[PDB]
Amino acid sequence: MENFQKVEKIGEGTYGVVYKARNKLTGEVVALKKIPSTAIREISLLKELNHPNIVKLLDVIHTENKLYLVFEFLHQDLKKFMDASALTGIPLPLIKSYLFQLLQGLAFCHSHRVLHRDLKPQNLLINTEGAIKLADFGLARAFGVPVRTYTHEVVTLWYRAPEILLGCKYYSTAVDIWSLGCIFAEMVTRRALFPGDSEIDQLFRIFRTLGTPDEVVWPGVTSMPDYKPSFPKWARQDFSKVVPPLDEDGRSLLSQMLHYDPNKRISAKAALAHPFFQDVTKPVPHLRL
Numbered sequence: 001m002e003n004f005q006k007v008e009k010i011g012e013g014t015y016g017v018v019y020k021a022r023n024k025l026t027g028e029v030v031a032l033k034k035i036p037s038t039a040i041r042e043i044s045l046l047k048e049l050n051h052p053n054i055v056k057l058l059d060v061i062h063t064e065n066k067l068y069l070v071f072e073f074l075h076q077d078l079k080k081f082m083d084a085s086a087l088t089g090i091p092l093p094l095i096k097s098y099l100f101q102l103l104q105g106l107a108f109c110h111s112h113r114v115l116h117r118d119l120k121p122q123n124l125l126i127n128t129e130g131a132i133k134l135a136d137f138g139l140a141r142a143f144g145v146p147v148r149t150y151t152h153e154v155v156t157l158w159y160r161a162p163e164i165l166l167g168c169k170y171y172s173t174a175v176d177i178w179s180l181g182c183i184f185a186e187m188v189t190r191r192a193l194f195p196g197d198s199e200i201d202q203l204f205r206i207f208r209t210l211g212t213p214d215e216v217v218w219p220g221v222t223s224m225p226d227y228k229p230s231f232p233k234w235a236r237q238d239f240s241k242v243v244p245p246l247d248e249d250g251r252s253l254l255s256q257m258l259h260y261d262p263n264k265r266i267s268a269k270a271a272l273a274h275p276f277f278q279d280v281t282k283p284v285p286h287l288r289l
């Protein structure tokens with residue numbers, strides 16, 4: 001770590017602090033994340049998982065019981081970009097380009113059987129060129145998803161798939177498609193889709209919009225560990241009310257990304273072929289750094 005000069009603190013992650021820093025040997029500006037043998041091997045497998053829409057893991061440094069991850073640095077995250085674009089909204093062509101690139105990132109990781117498990121706007125990073133990249137891919141399998149961060153901050157439930165909330169222990173790549181669907185809806189409407197503040201509030205917000213799931217829409221739901229027959233039965237809402245002014249192609253794609261049954265939920269690869277992307281382009285965002 002004597003090879004890095006900290007520039008500034010860029011945030012507090014789930015596992016530890018994130019700094020912007022300079023590598024003295026190469027002159028490289030990086031993001032430094034300050035975090036057991038099983039974690040070392042898993043994190044080392046991530047150094048190989050390279051794609052233009054995945055924040056590059058440059059190095060893993062393990063010294064004096066501390067783990068440091070050295071990543072490619074990007075100048076802004078999607079959460080801050082969405083807040084900065086609150087008054088006007090992010091233009092639809094830019095939302096579509098970001099969704100398309102995020103799906104490419106997911107299709108790549110999922111093809112290598114690597115799940116993210118904790119996608120959220122905070123871990124989507126953007127640059128001046130119009131790229132968007134997924135950060136922290138693979139970290140949840142290495143260290144777990146805790147209730148609170150190292151600073152006691154509450155880990156957000158807003159993008160959590162219903163099978164995780166219902167106690168499925170062996171979840172699939174579909175959990176990342178659900179989280180990305182929630183993010184897509186939030187970019188369009190400028191409001192979080194399901195801003196739960198407890199596990200039951202998160203689940204009941206999903207049920208109030210998509211309908212309480214049953215054996216018809218989700219075979220096996222009633223046998224899930226945390227399912228309770230006493231859950232209230234709410235009716236499903238039309239997407240036309242949920243995500244206006246999203247067009248019919250976008251609403252149909254979103255509906256497939258939010259299917260209750262993870263087996264029915266669209267894959268990233270199939271989502272890339274959706275008619276919503278017929279006119280996709282790569283616009284340049286308005287970024288003042």
Ligand SMILES: NC(=O)c1ccc(C(=O)Nc2cc(C3CC3)[nH]n2)cc1
Pocket residue numbers: 010011018031032033055071072073074075076077080125135136
């Ligand atoms: N708006 C701003 O000043 C702003 C917001 C976010 C960032 C940011 O998190 N950057 C990062 C993080 C990373 C890898 C995952 C560790 N690479 N790059 C930097 C600057």
